[PDB]
Amino acid sequence: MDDENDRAARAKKGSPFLNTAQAAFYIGLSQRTLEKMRLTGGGPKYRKHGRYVRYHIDELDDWSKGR
Amino acid sequence: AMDDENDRAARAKKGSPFLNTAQAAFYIGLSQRTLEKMRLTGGGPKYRKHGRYVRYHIDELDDWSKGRP
Amino acid sequence: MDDENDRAARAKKGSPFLNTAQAAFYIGLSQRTLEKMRLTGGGPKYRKHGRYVRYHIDELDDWSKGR
Amino acid sequence: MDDENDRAARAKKGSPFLNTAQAAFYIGLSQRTLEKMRLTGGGPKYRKHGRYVRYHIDELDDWSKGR
Ligand SMILES: [Cl-]
Ligand SMILES: [Cl-]
Ligand SMILES: [Cl-]
Ligand SMILES: [Cl-]
């Protein structure tokens, strides 16, 4: 394989990021449990998109599997 | 046809493939304690640790039921 | 058309599995009869759920219909 | 590795650049939100291609990943 052109072309076709409400529902936790995981750690990697918090679907899945 | 990260994220926004112990036990026809005990004895299905909360992927449940190695 | 989200949602609403007693009553056999068929390597396909034999309703019907 | 011929060959097949609408949708913010951040020094690096703003996908990802 993947170069910058494939990455850009895929990025124009959709998004891999979920918000907190979506990440929590997908992984089967309370939104508040997920938020509290940010502050104490132990939860999945997030991204700070400035103000907003965003979760990359493949980082959710990695965390779930222990990978 | 092979799904990319956009595809996976788009499905994840529409549902969840995970069950808690109580739901997983009901689905497989066992008591919750029996399923919990198998986490100690071994011999039950793969599960995920989502922090301190145990979750079961429905397809890893079906795998275990069907005897996939 | 079903994906992993559909399968989990359905699994959360009930169970397709019968124990030996239920399966026997359903196919019109004694519980003992159904066990011996299993122990002799015959009868319907079943699942080992740990120490507990379980029967999927559709595998029960497949075996009954000889197809 | 790449020589200049390789870079040119790749540039002739695709573009690594997204506009604001595309870049916003990919990182999961509104278009307006992403514009706003151009004034803040919070958001991702951008290129000014004359009058028009463009985001290199790899800089989008570096900013999200916190570099
Ligand atoms: Cl919770
Ligand atoms: Cl039981
Ligand atoms: Cl009989
Ligand atoms: Cl060169």
Author numbering:
A (entry chain C), C (entry chain A), D (entry chain D): 1 to 67
B (entry chain B): 0 to 68
Task: Copy text from the publication.
The recombination directionality factors from Mesorhizobium spp. (RdfS) are involved in regulating the excision and transfer of integrative and conjugative elements. Excision of ICEMlSymR7A requires IntS and the RDF (also known as excisionase) RdfS, which when expressed stimulates ICEMlSymR7A excision and the concomitant formation of attP and attB. Secondary-structure prediction of RdfS proteins found in Mesorhizobium spp. suggest that they are members of the MerR superfamily of winged-helix–turn–helix (wHTH) DNA-binding proteins. DNA binding by the RDF alters the recombinase–DNA nucleoprotein complex and often bends DNA to switch the favoured direction of recombination towards ICE excision.
In this study, we cloned and overexpressed RdfS from M. japonicum R7A and determined its X-ray crystal structure to 2.45 Å resolution. The finalized RdfS monomer structure was determined to closely match a majority (∼57%) of the ab initio model as predicted by AlphaFold; it contains a single winged-helix–turn–helix domain, as is common among DNA-binding proteins, and two additional helices at the N- and C-termini. The finalized crystal structure of RdfS reveals a head-to-tail polymer forming left-handed superhelices with large solvent channels. We note that the 21 C-terminal amino acids of the protein are completely dis­ordered, as expected from their sequence PPEPGSDDDKGGSGSADEGARS. The biological significance of this quaternary structure has yet to be confirmed; however, the superficial similarity to the polymers formed by other structurally similar proteins such as BldC and Xis may suggest a role for cooperative DNA binding in the regulation of ICE excision, the activation of conjugative transfer and transcriptional regulation.
